[PDB]
Design a protein around this ligand. Structure first.
Ligand SMILES: [Mg+2]
Ligand SMILES: [Mg+2]
Ligand SMILES: [Mg+2]
Ligand SMILES: [Mg+2]
Lengths: 296, 296, 296, 304
């Protein structure tokens, strides 16, 4: 199977006067490339995919593809939907725009059955010839891709190569790699990056790496080399910021931190997302002061 | 406040060869009108709103408005989204097409804060001059509209008149009506229709009423008339079917039941929804036989 | 079946210098009798059953029996355990000391299966000839007596006449009385006393009635008389105090309130229970000032 | 004072077994109990836990609690194997009494479960464990299992207890919460985190946990011991390989509430004479009995 693994970043989407700040978007991706990141994920959850137009989806994916040309860095495009016909369309568009693979979140809100999830992802996988990574985040979608369903999709669909897990469930992480060790388990939960990697996970899709890409990169590559002492040390050091970045729903804290570090020009969200409370604004700033933040 | 209350039906959306069966849709609404229902909800969760196109949303709302014209049955159109700009557009769209009010689900997947939910619904309410009913269903959305946020929205926004609760939380139902008894609490969970109504709830938005509109409307009208003995009698009699209609994610069982009862021509869903398991298909068919199902 | 229903109080156990204050206990029970209560529950959860000795269990039950002599007020003795042999012994114990019935909590900590729960309660019921009320509180015990198991026990064992539910699950309350309308469903959660009674529940076992016995007895008796309007009025008025009495684990707040009202001499718990935080102490004091607390 | 964290703490770590308690005609089978502990000793186990959850502590009498601790202490004499006695209670006065008892009968330390059923606050848990720790001079391992107790010892409370009390040296976690496991050792790396959930033994050890208190080791003591000692030597390949191989049995041993499956498995393997529980525990369903039997076929089960 063709795979996309390593240290990866769920890119925030900067706004300027209500529109995508395309120059800032490119600059942020270049900063990720220059700090050891192996792949970037445009228009995922952290990129506020739910409130972007389809034209803005295309714009962000195109900027990512253009910015990564001539480098080893891959573009793993967000391309999921609650509707199978739309997810298929978004997958084909991402492939057409030059993405290296797609990240496809489990359908949110309508709670498909496992049989429905299987048919959903089978249709997506058959629509493109680039790698497809599943994305399980039950706290946001209201459903769970079961271990058996993930494994069947991995075994039955050539291009589906693993899953990004954001489920706080290390038992499931053991279950997955014990019964199908060929899959690429990817951490979607920064605080437990090291435990997932040390059980044989092969990468992360990180929120924290927006702010600290070098530290997440080093953690991941230490772990992939089985230098678990050094990987755990970084995971432990990062725990405080990893947690404070979820004091309100992601991406409210990470966008706040990027603004606080001068990495984006405006603290703009698209409704229903909005600025954090004053108290959390201050708490994020205080945690940030403990970390070494790379510039441009 | 202008309100829309009483016995209401979250209409299924029948498909024929992958398209909305417009004649069946009108025929089903006529059947609701003839069995005492007070309002119909096109393109809600039960109507597979997530997989319909915007043109299909318009078609369903237009059929609902036309079929109810001259009958005093109101149209409470589903018009929610994870994106405030889209939810506002859908609200204005529903008003333009003649809806009497809108049902607007809490944003799914992106988990707005309470502050964001307030700004979200404030924007929606300000965009139209028809009643707006909030819809809280945390098991599907991943977020909860708190009692404080619901009450602030009710008091601050002229058009917001209540909430459809699908949360299995009778404590919260007491909390809501004890602190703001002027709001219209609407049951969004059929099995507990009577407990919500007997605490001062003023209506239901029902799944079961697709199949048994006469029984759900009588239950609601018994309760609103303070005949709690007879309202509870129907709620108790309905418990078995009320539960089996969620043995898989709604609307998979109710569409199965409508097909089994001869009320729709084909058991078609849009992916990622699909037919139930063979065992659940059998369980639904067995529970249905204990009830008298009105024809056309 | 012989039954014990109506307005009932889960009695606090006052301590003086670490010992059960027998004079205060009798005085508090008399205050319940004089304010319309139908039965009292010595040495339940609210009575700190977990930290009392077997001899202190005896003392409290005997005082309850003695104080109720010459009145209609029943003694429904706490007599449950995680060990079946101990629960049997405590049941016979309670009957020997003159109790009118027993309240028997589901085994905590060891998580028996439904078959084990059936055998547990069958053994208890066969050990005495007085009524036995089941008590389901999964947040405390770690297990749930299912509806099916409750109904089988009710139908198979002469003495088992119902269940006290503290489970935040009005759906289950419908389930229970829809399938077995002959049982006595008793509210174990004060905030939802009225919804449980209006669905056909026949009593409450209350924490709040320790402080406000007249209001809880009036609420229950209105509901039993089918004056649902007047019962709901009291339930709504009591919501604030009903909630603040669980701002920390019961009985920490109710003992605090009894101390603040001058009804017990000292704010004494047995470890691991202890005084509330200063912040919660103040919140309890403020909520109390909206209510008329009967003296002796 | 608040500065015990780097002062000398006696610890009990390594591969440890939560011993089942065999019954014969309703009584503790004392000969079987001794024989089972011998089998653990001979298969590389570092400590045994008498009368914990797996030992049906809830249904044993105080006298049976006594007898089981005494047999464990006597059987482990003359070996390296430690006795970490179950000694917890929902009542602080009883937990103190059980702690002193375990010390006076020769236990090496105590495992003290968070109070069940009465749901103490964090302040109450702190005072609870401070009282227990001050009553003895032997090591105390906290035990957090919220699915059974209805309460949680928070990370801050565990760390405060470690720093404020001389003899509290760590926590057995059975909480399905690897985030909390990171939280604990990132903020207080000096404590001994012990796995209380067999399926995730390797993830807990690879994050710096220093032992397991195992259900599976009743049946497969050599495998759990090997897993633990590989991990302690930082042979993470070998440790993970065993953890993966054990997943099927690790999960099926909880298809019904522990210890119903493990006693069923011990009976099926001929290691105990009768499948007897004390009510309210009882035999598994016939379907789960068969599932346990089938999962066992994958594994090499040591005899006596
Ligand atoms: Mg290298
Ligand atoms: Mg009408
Ligand atoms: Mg070695
Ligand atoms: Mg490894």
């Amino acid at each position: 199977k063709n795979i996309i693994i390593g240290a990866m970043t769920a890119l925030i989407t900067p706004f300027k006067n209500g529109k995508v700040d395309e120059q800032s978007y490119a600059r942020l991706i270049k900063r990720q490339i220059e700090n050891g990141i192996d792949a970037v994920v445009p228009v995922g959850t952290t990129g506020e995919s739910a409130t972007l137009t389809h034209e803005e989806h295309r714009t962000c994916i195109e900027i990512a593809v253009e910015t990564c040309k001539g480098t080893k860095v891959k573009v793993l495009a967000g391309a999921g939907s609650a509707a199978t016909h739309e997810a298929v369309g978004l997958a084909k568009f991402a492939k057409e725009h030059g993405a290296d693979g797609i990240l496809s979140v489990a359908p949110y809100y309508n709670k498909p059955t496992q049989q429905g999830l299987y048919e959903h992802y089978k249709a997506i996988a058959q629509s493109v010839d680039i790698p497809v990574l599943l994305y399980n985040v039950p706290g946001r979608t209201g459903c769970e891709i079961s271990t058996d369903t993930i494994i069947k999709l991995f075994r039955d669909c050539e291009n589906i190569y693993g899953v990004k897990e954001a489920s706080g469930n290390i038992d499931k992480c053991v279950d997955l790699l014990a019964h199908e060790p060929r899959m690429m388990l990817i951490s979607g939960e920064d605080a437990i990056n090291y435990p997932i990697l040390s059980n044989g996970g092969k990468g992360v899709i990180s929120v924290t790496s927006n702010l600290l890409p070098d530290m997440i990169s080093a953690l991941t590559h230490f772990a992939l080399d089985e230098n678990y002492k050094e990987a755990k040390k970084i995971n432990d050091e990062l725990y405080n910021i990893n947690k404070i970045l979820f004091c309100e729903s992601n991406p409210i804290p990470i966008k706040t931190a990027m603004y606080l570090a001068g990495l984006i020009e405006s603290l703009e969200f698209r409704l229903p997302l909005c600025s954090p409370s004053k108290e959390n604004f201050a708490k994020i700033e205080e945690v940030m002061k403990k970390y070494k933040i790379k510039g441009f």
